[PDB]
Write an enzyme that holds these catalytic residues in place. Structure first.
Site, mmCIF file in Angstrom:
data_model
loop_
_atom_site.group_PDB
_atom_site.id
_atom_site.type_symbol
_atom_site.label_atom_id
_atom_site.label_comp_id
_atom_site.label_asym_id
_atom_site.label_seq_id
_atom_site.Cartn_x
_atom_site.Cartn_y
_atom_site.Cartn_z
ATOM 1 N N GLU B 60 6.441 -12.768 -4.260
ATOM 2 C CA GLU B 60 6.571 -12.915 -2.689
ATOM 3 C C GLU B 60 6.721 -14.718 -1.909
ATOM 4 O OE1 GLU B 60 2.351 -13.466 -0.844
ATOM 5 O OE2 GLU B 60 3.377 -11.573 0.293
ATOM 6 N N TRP B 82 3.541 -5.129 0.559
ATOM 7 C CA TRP B 82 4.202 -5.275 1.905
ATOM 8 C C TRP B 82 5.086 -3.328 2.230
ATOM 9 C CZ3 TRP B 82 4.248 -9.087 6.213
ATOM 10 C CH2 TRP B 82 3.753 -10.360 5.521
ATOM 11 N N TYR B 146 7.384 -13.386 7.565
ATOM 12 C CA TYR B 146 7.524 -14.147 7.910
ATOM 13 C C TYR B 146 8.962 -15.341 6.776
ATOM 14 C CZ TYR B 146 2.440 -14.455 7.807
ATOM 15 O OH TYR B 146 0.559 -14.023 7.895
ATOM 16 N N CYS B 198 -0.857 -13.495 10.226
ATOM 17 C CA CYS B 198 -2.556 -14.170 10.044
ATOM 18 C C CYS B 198 -2.193 -15.232 9.772
ATOM 19 C CB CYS B 198 -1.985 -13.308 8.938
ATOM 20 S SG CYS B 198 -3.234 -11.173 8.965
ATOM 21 N N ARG B 218 -5.356 -17.457 11.980
ATOM 22 C CA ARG B 218 -6.250 -16.562 12.938
ATOM 23 C C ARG B 218 -7.353 -15.658 12.743
ATOM 24 N NH1 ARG B 218 -2.905 -11.823 12.684
ATOM 25 N NH2 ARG B 218 -3.950 -10.704 14.343
ATOM 26 N N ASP B 221 -9.151 -12.301 5.533
ATOM 27 C CA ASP B 221 -10.157 -11.493 4.918
ATOM 28 C C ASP B 221 -10.762 -11.870 3.807
ATOM 29 O OD1 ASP B 221 -10.791 -9.336 2.776
ATOM 30 O OD2 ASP B 221 -9.233 -7.597 4.052
HETATM 31 C C1 LIG Z 1 -3.245 -11.158 0.877
HETATM 32 C C2 LIG Z 1 -2.211 -10.031 0.624
HETATM 33 C C3 LIG Z 1 -0.992 -9.752 0.978
HETATM 34 N N1 LIG Z 1 -1.720 -7.983 1.179
HETATM 35 C C4 LIG Z 1 -1.998 -7.151 2.158
HETATM 36 C C5 LIG Z 1 -2.481 -7.476 3.457
HETATM 37 C C6 LIG Z 1 -1.890 -6.778 4.402
HETATM 38 C C7 LIG Z 1 -3.376 -6.117 5.572
HETATM 39 C C8 LIG Z 1 -4.681 -6.874 5.613
HETATM 40 N N2 LIG Z 1 -5.368 -5.553 6.463
HETATM 41 C C9 LIG Z 1 -6.452 -5.735 7.036
HETATM 42 N N3 LIG Z 1 -7.474 -5.663 7.442
HETATM 43 N N4 LIG Z 1 -6.730 -6.315 4.836
HETATM 44 C C10 LIG Z 1 -6.174 -7.127 3.803
HETATM 45 O O1 LIG Z 1 -7.073 -7.827 3.116
HETATM 46 C C11 LIG Z 1 -5.046 -7.198 4.305
HETATM 47 C C12 LIG Z 1 -3.866 -7.493 3.683
HETATM 48 C C13 LIG Z 1 -2.582 -7.135 -0.372
HETATM 49 C C14 LIG Z 1 -2.165 -6.175 -0.142
HETATM 50 C C15 LIG Z 1 -3.143 -5.654 -1.539
HETATM 51 C C16 LIG Z 1 -4.229 -6.359 -2.640
HETATM 52 C C17 LIG Z 1 -4.239 -6.384 -3.728
HETATM 53 O O2 LIG Z 1 -3.314 -5.403 -4.602
HETATM 54 N N5 LIG Z 1 -5.564 -6.106 -3.943
HETATM 55 C C18 LIG Z 1 -7.112 -6.766 -4.219
HETATM 56 C C19 LIG Z 1 -8.123 -6.373 -3.673
HETATM 57 C C20 LIG Z 1 -8.384 -4.890 -3.665
HETATM 58 C C21 LIG Z 1 -8.506 -4.319 -2.473
HETATM 59 O O3 LIG Z 1 -9.286 -4.924 -1.452
HETATM 60 O O4 LIG Z 1 -7.970 -2.850 -2.385
HETATM 61 C C22 LIG Z 1 -7.198 -8.156 -4.892
HETATM 62 O O5 LIG Z 1 -7.983 -8.554 -5.179
HETATM 63 O O6 LIG Z 1 -5.431 -7.810 -5.476
HETATM 64 C C23 LIG Z 1 -3.723 -7.448 -2.020
HETATM 65 C C24 LIG Z 1 -3.021 -8.841 -1.353
HETATM 66 O O1 LIG Z 2 -1.845 -11.393 5.252
HETATM 67 C C1 LIG Z 2 -2.903 -11.025 5.308
HETATM 68 C C2 LIG Z 2 -2.619 -9.921 6.770
HETATM 69 C C3 LIG Z 2 -4.528 -9.331 6.747
HETATM 70 N N1 LIG Z 2 -4.635 -9.617 6.949
HETATM 71 C C4 LIG Z 2 -6.326 -9.063 7.679
HETATM 72 C C5 LIG Z 2 -6.801 -10.120 8.176
HETATM 73 C C6 LIG Z 2 -7.941 -8.988 9.456
HETATM 74 O O2 LIG Z 2 -8.768 -9.222 8.350
HETATM 75 C C7 LIG Z 2 -7.116 -7.493 9.009
HETATM 76 C C8 LIG Z 2 -5.760 -7.599 10.004
HETATM 77 O O3 LIG Z 2 -6.436 -7.305 11.501
HETATM 78 P P1 LIG Z 2 -5.687 -8.555 12.409
HETATM 79 O O4 LIG Z 2 -6.128 -9.683 12.025
HETATM 80 O O5 LIG Z 2 -4.462 -8.581 12.731
HETATM 81 O O6 LIG Z 2 -6.716 -7.868 14.015
HETATM 82 O O7 LIG Z 2 -6.268 -7.959 7.689
HETATM 83 C C9 LIG Z 2 -5.481 -11.057 5.424
HETATM 84 O O8 LIG Z 2 -6.272 -11.717 5.791
HETATM 85 N N2 LIG Z 2 -4.401 -11.714 5.295
#
Ligand SMILES: C#CCN(Cc1ccc2[nH]c(N)nc(=O)c2c1)c1ccc(C(=O)N[C@@H](CCC(=O)O)C(=O)O)cc1
Ligand SMILES: O=c1ccn([C@H]2C[C@H](O)[C@@H](COP(=O)(O)O)O2)c(=O)[nH]1
Ligand SMILES: C#CCN(Cc1ccc2[nH]c(N)nc(=O)c2c1)c1ccc(C(=O)N[C@@H](CCC(=O)O)C(=O)O)cc1
Ligand SMILES: O=c1ccn([C@H]2C[C@H](O)[C@@H](COP(=O)(O)O)O2)c(=O)[nH]1
Lengths: 316, 316
Positions: B60, B82, B146, B198, B218, B221
């Site tokens: 990534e 993504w 990004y 983010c 900003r 999670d």
């Molecule tokens: C970070 C980042 C990019 N991302 C994308 C991304 C995009 C929007 C978001 N939006 C919100 N609200 N929360 C997020 O965590 C979030 C993450 C990720 C995608 C999947 C996993 C994953 O494969 N599994 C997790 C946890 C399991 C789960 O909660 O489903 C792991 O622990 O590996 C981690 C990160």
């Molecule tokens: O790379 C990322 C993408 C998303 N989020 C989280 C932020 C929020 O917890 C939720 C998205 O809602 P907004 O923050 O965009 O309002 O996903 C992450 O922590 N990391």
């Protein structure tokens, strides 16, 4: 006491601060990464251990809130903070006739023969601007400055964006948003800009009914650069809340390079001796709401009991 | 132990965290304003109390470093992070023929009949993209992401700016600069964007020969969103240093809204029971220097001894 965090930050840099040279070559005790908070619902974080000019802060903040960038408004308010950035053009012009002002800021820092002429030519430019309506239009307008950044984001297709406005809109339509950001950093203006914005980006936060704000600044001249930053950004938090009908919460101040110039230390050790006195009280006009017209007498500062003014030297 | 700060942040939010509703309606324990640091010269801050996929992070990060935004590279690397942002268009298209994927993310969260079709159509789109060269060009390219933000800042007059590049240039020409900022927040794309970035802005810092970096986001999670953010941004710090010939320093992570989803708490209380094990060691290829081509096998992670994987639910 309310301001403690700043004294602790000052104290800190003095101790674990590390030396660092400067662009405007001096030395600086610097630290990278730092957050400090103030509960605005307990008093206005306007320093009591040193005289801080709230007048300058207000007028300047209203200029910003009007998206105005012309130096006329500031002079109108007996405010000269940004003058030097206007003068730098007035002099770097075909129209300039007189004392070669080259590096005037530095030469006046110790001001010998250059002293009079610089400060004399200063009265000139400001006299010109304040009254000569057309002069003001050319040399008074700074162009890219917090106000225009905030309310006139130069887009890719000519149009303009009012970040601050659309943001308060955001806070109103849906307050629990993590997207309330007002960026002042534009990648294309920063490389060809006098002074890239210090207070780079701020995010608001609405929860439990209170409005909190976080200010990020890549650089921090702790002695005179921080005490204004704190106040101004704490003032913006009351204005927005008052506009959106929120109770004010706390203001958070995060720094990139927080530092103390090597030629400021005596003055700062001096301050660290006095003890903070009860925080000033801010009073807000209950009648007007559209913050964009919340003029001078709409913001009142009650019972500010500061320690005398500690002079220091401009960082050139 | 090296990761402590994150466990302390988790711990923190669990205690003084306040409830807050969500856009994607759930609940969240939230805190506003927080900084945590890790001394990269003491180990790689890759969590040992939970299995973190360094493979996903690297691929990534290289995608980002190539200013590539097409989902092809990621799939090529067995990375699907993504995908959902691509699928959202593929389906919102005239070409889409099949199972009405409306709100597929939510419906699959509990996945009943929609389950198969969604994940089946997913294989479809990714099969299409990976091989159909033209399909990839239309539906695989995310546009604003990004990488393009970092290396292709869409200017006011068509041209493109490589922030990251010109920044490393900055670090090289003059390292002691307080202007080393790489902003990802663009005022005009954020209102009409799927997910505003983010990890909003980061600033580097050069002093005493070490490179330190500060990341501002900003939103956070904490459960699954922070453990990746930490690692990726700690990885970027070794890459730049290795590129510019600097010794790595520490990475600073500042948050806007740091929070823990209401449906993640059991899993997080679970983690807080295990004790951190010695930090993994990062190894860097000494031969190649131009980080922009520092491919997969150029970054090696030595002796990572993680605690088992704690599954949680996607925040929809
Ligand atoms: C970070 C980042 C990019 N991302 C994308 C991304 C995009 C929007 C978001 N939006 C919100 N609200 N929360 C997020 O965590 C979030 C993450 C990720 C995608 C999947 C996993 C994953 O494969 N599994 C997790 C946890 C399991 C789960 O909660 O489903 C792991 O622990 O590996 C981690 C990160
Ligand atoms: O790379 C990322 C993408 C998303 N989020 C989280 C932020 C929020 O917890 C939720 C998205 O809602 P907004 O923050 O965009 O309002 O996903 C992450 O922590 N990391
Ligand atoms: C902040 C801001 C905007 N500004 C402008 C501004 C612009 C560039 C900068 N550049 C540098 N390197 N340091 C700065 O402090 C700084 C400040 C200010 C201008 C003057 C005073 C002032 O009138 N006197 C001071 C301290 C005395 C002194 O050091 O000369 C005071 O205490 O009131 C304060 C702030
Ligand atoms: O509003 C302002 C303007 C400037 N400075 C300081 C930041 C630095 O200490 C010096 C400018 O050098 P750069 O940070 O721009 O490199 O002035 C402030 O603290 N506040």
């Amino acid at each position: 006491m309310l301001e403690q965090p700043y004294l602790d930050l000052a104290k800190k840099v003095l101790d674990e601060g590390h030396f660092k040279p400067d662009r405007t070559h001096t030395g600086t005790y610097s630290i990278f990464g730092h957050q400090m908070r103030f509960d605005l619902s307990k008093g206005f974080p306007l320093l009591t251990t040193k005289k801080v000019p709230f007048g300058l802060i207000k007028s300047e903040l209203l200029w910003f809130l009007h998206g105005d960038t012309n130096i006329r408004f500031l002079l109108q308010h007996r405010n000269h903070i940004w003058d030097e950035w206007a003068f730098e053009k007035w002099v770097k012009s075909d129209e300039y006739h007189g004392p070669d002002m080259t590096d005037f800021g530095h030469r006046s820092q110790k001001d010998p023969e250059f002293a009079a002429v610089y400060h004399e030519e200063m009265a000139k430019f400001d006299d010109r601007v304040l009254h000569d309506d057309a002069f003001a239009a050319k040399y008074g307008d700074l162009g890219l400055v917090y106000g225009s950044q905030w309310r006139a984001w130069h887009t890719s297709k000519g149009d303009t964006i009012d970040q601050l406005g659309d943001v308060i809109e955001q806070i109103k339509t849906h307050p629990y948003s993590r997207r309330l950001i007002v960026s002042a950093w534009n990648p294309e203006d920063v490389p060809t800009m006098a002074l890239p914005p210090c207070h780079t980006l701020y995010q608001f936060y609405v929860n439990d009914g209170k409005l909190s704000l976080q200010l990020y600044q890549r650089s921090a001249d702790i002695f005179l650069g921080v005490p204004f930053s704190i106040a101004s950004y704490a003032l913006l938090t009351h204005l927005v809340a008052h506009e959106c009908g929120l109770e004010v919460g706390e203001f958070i101040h995060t720094f990139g390079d927080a530092h103390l110039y090597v030629n400021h230390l005596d003055q700062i050790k001096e301050q660290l001796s006095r003890t903070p006195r009860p925080a000033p009280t801010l009073q807000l006009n209950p009648d007007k709401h559209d913050i964009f017209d919340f003029d001078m007498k709409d913001i009142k500062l009650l019972n500010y009991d500061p320690y005398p003014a500690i002079k220091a030297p401009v960082a050139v």
